[PDB]
Ligand binder design. Structure first.
Ligand code: 6U4
Ligand code: MN
Ligand code: MN
Ligand code: MN
Length: 156
């Protein structure tokens, strides 16, 4: 059995567009991604998600809703990434570039899948249909999925 580390991922999903951030450095740099990072000691997962959204995009929200959970395994890394995925209830400010992320709005017929993590092609359509999900993806490196599982659930 493996240990897992808690991460968050936040999608600001509005009726016709979604906010994504171009990762400027670190893990997954060069790909569009939701906003998020490691959960810190003391905070709930949801509060860590709100904190990372504020740090990385400038947006301050009072509440998120859980939409999914995805476990990532990487060849050669024993620690799993346990990623808790959230969507915003509402927003009330503008996105701002941070050192980690450059935010940009994408229309929902222009989701930039080819420049996102490959797993997003599988689970992001469920998020768009407002369906909750559990996923697991094993990667060789950054590009190649060796095994994956994706299941719709009633409760995340
Ligand atoms: N395969 C994948 N697909 C995806 O859509 N998002 C992934 C992913 N693998 C990791 N992520 C996301 C989860 C989380 O939001 C982020 C990884 O955490 P980060 O390294 O961004 O954490 P931090 O922002 O704390 O890092 P620092 O800013 O360096 O402290 O990338
Ligand atoms: Mn961060
Ligand atoms: Mn981050
Ligand atoms: Mn962080």
């Amino acid at each position: 059995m493996k240990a897992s580390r808690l991460y968050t991922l936040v999608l600001v999903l509005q009726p016709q567009r979604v906010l994504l951030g171009m990762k400027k450095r670190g893990f997954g740099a060069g790909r569009w991604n939701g906003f998020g990072g490691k959960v810190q000691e003391g905070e709930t997962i949801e509060d860590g998600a709100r904190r990372e959204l504020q740090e990385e995009s400038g947006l301050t929200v009072d509440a998120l809703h859980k939409v999914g959970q995805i476990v990532f395994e990487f060849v050669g890394e024993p620690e799993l990434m346990d990623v808790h995925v959230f969507c915003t209830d509402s927003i009330q400010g503008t996105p701002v570039e941070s050192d980690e992320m450059r935010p940009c709005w994408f229309q929902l017929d222009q989701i930039p899948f080819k420049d996102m993590w490959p797993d997003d092609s599988y689970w992001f359509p469920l998020l768009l249909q407002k369906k909750k999900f559990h996923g697991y993806f094993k990667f060789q490196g950054q590009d190649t999925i060796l095994d994956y599982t994706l299941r719709e659930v009633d409760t995340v």
